[PDB]
Amino acid sequence: ESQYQVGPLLGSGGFGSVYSGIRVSDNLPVAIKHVEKDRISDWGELPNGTRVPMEVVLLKKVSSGFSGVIRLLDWFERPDSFVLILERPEPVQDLFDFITERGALQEELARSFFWQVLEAVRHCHNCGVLHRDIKDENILIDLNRGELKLIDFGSGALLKDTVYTDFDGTRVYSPPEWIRYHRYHGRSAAVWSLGILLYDMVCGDIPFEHDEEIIRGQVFFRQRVSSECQHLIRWCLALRPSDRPTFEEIQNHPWMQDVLLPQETAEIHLH
Numbered sequence: 001e002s003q004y005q006v007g008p009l010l011g012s013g014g015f016g017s018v019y020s021g022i023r024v025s026d027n028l029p030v031a032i033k034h035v036e037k038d039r040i041s042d043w044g045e046l047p048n049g050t051r052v053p054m055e056v057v058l059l060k061k062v063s064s065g066f067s068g069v070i071r072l073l074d075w076f077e078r079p080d081s082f083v084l085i086l087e088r089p090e091p092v093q094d095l096f097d098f099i100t101e102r103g104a105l106q107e108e109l110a111r112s113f114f115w116q117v118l119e120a121v122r123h124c125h126n127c128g129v130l131h132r133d134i135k136d137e138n139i140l141i142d143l144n145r146g147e148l149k150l151i152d153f154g155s156g157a158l159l160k161d162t163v164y165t166d167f168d169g170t171r172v173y174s175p176p177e178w179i180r181y182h183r184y185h186g187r188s189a190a191v192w193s194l195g196i197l198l199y200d201m202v203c204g205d206i207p208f209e210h211d212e213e214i215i216r217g218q219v220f221f222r223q224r225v226s227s228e229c230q231h232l233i234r235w236c237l238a239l240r241p242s243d244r245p246t247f248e249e250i251q252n253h254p255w256m257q258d259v260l261l262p263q264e265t266a267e268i269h270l271h
């Protein structure tokens with residue numbers, strides 16, 4: 001308000017508009033996200049009645065006890081919008097931009113990044129939060145430390161064990177049961193999206209652009225990809241939801257063994 005200086009617009013879209021900023025009191029880098037009230041579908045409430053976007057409830061749930069998920073520092077209400085203050089690593093690059101620039105990632109680098117995304121999604125789920133929009137656009141890379149951060153909880157929901165029948169994340173990462181039936185369970189839909197994301201990292205682009213391709217579930221590799229990495233992708237993209245791996249089965253897969261630590265990853269790949 002006068003607590004923050006605003007710097008450049010970092011992006012805008014379905015998610016409203018997000019700006020780079022600095023917290024005046026201690027110069028802490030922050031991101032400042034403006035969410036229009038008209039565009040919030042889900043509202044939650046705080047343990048004291050205050051009515052908030054669900055995104056704020058979800059961020060508070062996962063605020064606790066990691067570093068692979070973005071931290072909500074503060075929020076404000078305005079007549080037509082909420083304003084969320086989020087942490088901001090610096091230097092940082094969004095993973096979508098990084099893959100635009102480098103193309104397909106070497107498997108060692110994709111394995112370190114993918115592993116870190118699995119740790120961040122397991123943390124959301126352990127805190128009772130389903131993200132519902134895992135994709136390269138929603139992952140930031142801290143370039144000095146090689147640490148990834150999952151961001152943008154504006155499509156997320158409380159995690160539950162029954163079926164979801166609404167969805168507003170990214171269609172090209174959504175599963176065949178959502179396309180066909182408008183119904184999915186949270187964890188198996190999250191594993192499908194992680195299959196899309198892993199194919200995106202190792203091939204430099206997503207496998208499916210059309211509904212008909214998502215429902216057929218046939219995966220073709222246009223880049224040289226090891227048979228263990230293709231096996232994992234094709235498992236995550238199983239057509240039947242119950243044939244997809246759990247998070248523990250993904251992290252015990254042969255392709256996931258010997259992961260680099262984030263700092264080594266930065267030393268080797270991010271300079």
Ligand SMILES: N[C@H]1CC[C@H](Nc2cncc(-c3cccc(/C=C4\SC(=O)NC4=O)c3)n2)CC1
Nearest residue numbers: 010011012015018031086087088094137151152
């Ligand atoms: N949904 C797209 C909106 C454009 C954005 N693009 C960028 C580009 N550079 C930095 C950041 C950034 C930095 C620090 C924090 C955050 C956190 C956010 S942004 C958001 O919508 N929800 C968040 O939690 C984002 N975002 C990629 C998320």
